Structure 1
Amino acid sequence: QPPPKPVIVDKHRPVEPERRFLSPEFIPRRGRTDPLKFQIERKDMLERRKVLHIPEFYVGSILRVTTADPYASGKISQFLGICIQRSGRGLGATFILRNVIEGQGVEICFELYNPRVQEIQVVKLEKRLDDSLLYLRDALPEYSTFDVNMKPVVQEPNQKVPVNELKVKMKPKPWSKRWERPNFNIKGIRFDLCLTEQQMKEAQKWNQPWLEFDMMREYDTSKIEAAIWKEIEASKRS
């Protein structure tokens, strides 16, 4: 006897179409230079993309990566971790991964364009309220501890990014970065238990409201992103 085939079809109309998304490492930095640099690096990373897929993701997503290592069992290295940040631009761009195993918190900075790495895989795709999850260091280990054998949570092909709106408990005050300040504007943590009302009142004194209203510091990216899309589509057609 052959097994039946699973099939599922749920067709709410104004949910299915998600249109566009671009990676934050294509965009250049505010610094000045001649954009031919950018465009040649872009076509280079795209001629690499034709080989390697980089299944898109965000901070707070879980990635499993297999890489070709010279000195290891099977000459390969397989590592799963939570994405902390995607830092840098051009080819040297990288993404951080972290996980607690054997009670020890190990984290890597993977180059997403180095030929040493063989394949990347998105086990779970989600987004956190905070731009960067570096406070997961001082956070409890039970939040970062993830299973290595956990299989990919299959995600819909054309749907909106799921966002887990949650909060996180943390280790006591002796921290390294002073996350309580408003310089970072993070919300995953829970002041109500991580500190006192008087303490947050004393800390929110460094608040600089004027800068977020300032306008010469923010960088417009609309037409740059449009030209980047145009060049990507041209390279794909070619």
Structure 2
Amino acid sequence: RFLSPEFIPRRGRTDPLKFQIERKDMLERRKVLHIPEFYVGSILRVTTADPYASGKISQFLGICIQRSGRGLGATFILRNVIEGQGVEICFELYNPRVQEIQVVKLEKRLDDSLLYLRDALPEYSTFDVNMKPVVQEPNQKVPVNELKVKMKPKPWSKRWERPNFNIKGIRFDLCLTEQQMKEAQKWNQPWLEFDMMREYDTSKIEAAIWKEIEASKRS
């Protein structure tokens, strides 16, 4: 009863007929596979099929850094350092080269986009390739392994210290100093938090999506 973030449309004006057709196609596609619900920071294992590889069946494991897109576009990057080499694959849940979407864990890590893992040391990226699933507490609050993440030296690539990103996960005490924190906070915009016009409501849209999903499931 959480609704995948792929159905919720964007604020962009258009014809609801397009969104309805997209939702119908997404439901018809999900009717075949399973596509379980997962959040950011959860380990996943998608078994795709490639035309050239050791066997037509392919496999890969990683953590969902983020997820966006609408309609048939449900992208999600999977991070998994193997053999001491960073690798990232952008998979889409609505592809024809999909067979099984196994979920290993269900976490949130506060931050809704773990894009700073690229700058983090390899310790928080390497994981076992043949790990078993971990399911517990059906229909209950999803656990959140609230833990900080140490960062590499100052040379970064996205300036994660600024407040515009809003991470609340990086351990700035063990990396940044007072002057760095001050220079980062200098670019603060308290008016964005109080801007009640940028919020995109979805109550009625969520209810309509749930009604359509129920109607499609019951017919």
TM over 0.5: yes
Aligned partners of 1:21, 1:209: CA distance in 2, in Å? 30
Shift of 1:119: 1.1
List gaps (5 residues or longer) in structure 2: none
Shift of 1:187: 1.2
Look up the SS of the partner of 2:155 in the other structure: coil
Shift of 1:154: 2.3
Shift of 1:91: 0.2
Aligned partners of 1:53, 1:127: CA distance in 2, in Å? 21
- TM-score calculated relative to the size of structure 2: 0.98
- TM-score calculated relative to the size of structure 1: 0.90
Look up the SS of the partner of 1:191 in the other structure: coil
User: Residue deviations 1:154-204, cap 9 Å, x none?
Assistant: 222222110111101011111110000011111110111121012101110
Aligned partners of 1:127, 1:147: CA distance in 2, in Å? 20
Look up the SS of the partner of 2:67 in the other structure: strand
Q: CA RMSD in A?
A: 0.8
Aligned partners of 1:66, 1:162: CA distance in 2, in Å? 25
Shift of 1:93: 1.8
User: Residue deviations 1:90-126, cap 9 Å, x none?
Assistant: 1022111111000001111101001112111101111
List gaps (5 residues or longer) in structure 1: 1-19
Aligned to 1:16: none
Shift of 1:224: 0.4
Aligned partners of 2:157, 2:4: CA distance in 1, in Å? 30
Shift of 1:229: 0.4
Computing the radius of gyration over CA atoms, which structure comes out larger, 1 or 2? 1
Shift of 1:73: 1.0
Instruction: After superposing the two structures, state which structure 1 stretch, 43-52 or 150-159, moved more.
Output: 150-159
Look up the SS of the partner of 1:77 in the other structure: coil
**Hey, which of these two has a bigger chunk of strand by percent?**
1
Shift of 1:29: 0.7
Aligned partners of 2:98, 2:158: CA distance in 1, in Å? 31
CA contact (8 A) 2:5 2:68 kept: no
Aligned partners of 2:136, 2:44: CA distance in 1, in Å? 14
Shift of 1:71: 0.4
Aligned partners of 1:27, 1:124: CA distance in 2, in Å? 24
Aligned to 2:28: 47
Shift of 1:145: 0.5
Aligned partners of 1:230, 1:78: CA distance in 2, in Å? 35
Look up the SS of the partner of 1:159 in the other structure: coil
Aligned partners of 1:152, 1:92: CA distance in 2, in Å? 26
Aligned-pair identity in percent equals: 100
User: Residue deviations 1:43-85, cap 9 Å, x none?
Assistant: 1110111111111110000001101111011111100001100
- Counterpart among 181, 194, 207 of residue 188 in structure 2: 207
Shift of 1:87: 1.5
Aligned partners of 2:94, 2:136: CA distance in 1, in Å? 24
Look up the SS of the partner of 1:211 in the other structure: helix
Aligned partners of 2:63, 2:131: CA distance in 1, in Å? 13
CA contact (8 A) 2:80 2:127 kept: yes
> Across the two proteins, how many residue pairs are aligned to each other?
219
